[PDB]
Amino acid sequence: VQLQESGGGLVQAGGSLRLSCAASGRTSSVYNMAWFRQTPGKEREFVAAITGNGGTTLYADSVKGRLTISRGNAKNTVSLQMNVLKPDDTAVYYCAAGGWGKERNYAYWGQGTQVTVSSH
Ligand SMILES: [Cl-]
Numbered sequence: 524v525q526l527q528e529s530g531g532g533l534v535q536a537g538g539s540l541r542l543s544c545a546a547s548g549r550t551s552s553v554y555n556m557a558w559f560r561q562t563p564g565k566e567r568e569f570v571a572a573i574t575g576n577g578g579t580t581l582y583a584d585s586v587k588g589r590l591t592i593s594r595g596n597a598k599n600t601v602s603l604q605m606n607v608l609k610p611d612d613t614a615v616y617y618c619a620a621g622g623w624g625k626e627r628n629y630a631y632w633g634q635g636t637q638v639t640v641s642s643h
């Protein structure tokens with residue numbers, strides 16, 4: 524199983540981005556999926572997660588009411604709607620799958636997509 528991300532980029536503060544992630548390869552399960560983020564010299568930190576059936580979500584406090592995680596239509600797809608972005612949201616964002624909770628013990632990881640939020 525491999526994970527591919529899209530939707531990153533450079534955006535002005537107050538703007539919005541929608542990150543997307545999709546599993547490729549034969550998956551034998553519907554997985555829980557998550558997003559983490561990493562700034563230079565620091566660790567990947569939890570942002571949000573959603574269970575396989577879409578019924579349960581978990582969010583870091585710093586993004587509550589601004590970021591919303593959801594499942595996509597295809598099997599093992601997830602989106603992260605990022606609104607009201609701030610410069611501190613600048614990071615590489617990683618999709619993960621196969622796990623639960625806020626630690627980095629998820630079985631599958633994407634290779635990251637850069638988000639940069641700039642004042643304008
Ligand atoms: Cl890490």
Ligand SMILES: [Cl-]
Binds near residue numbers: 623
């Ligand atoms: Cl899972």
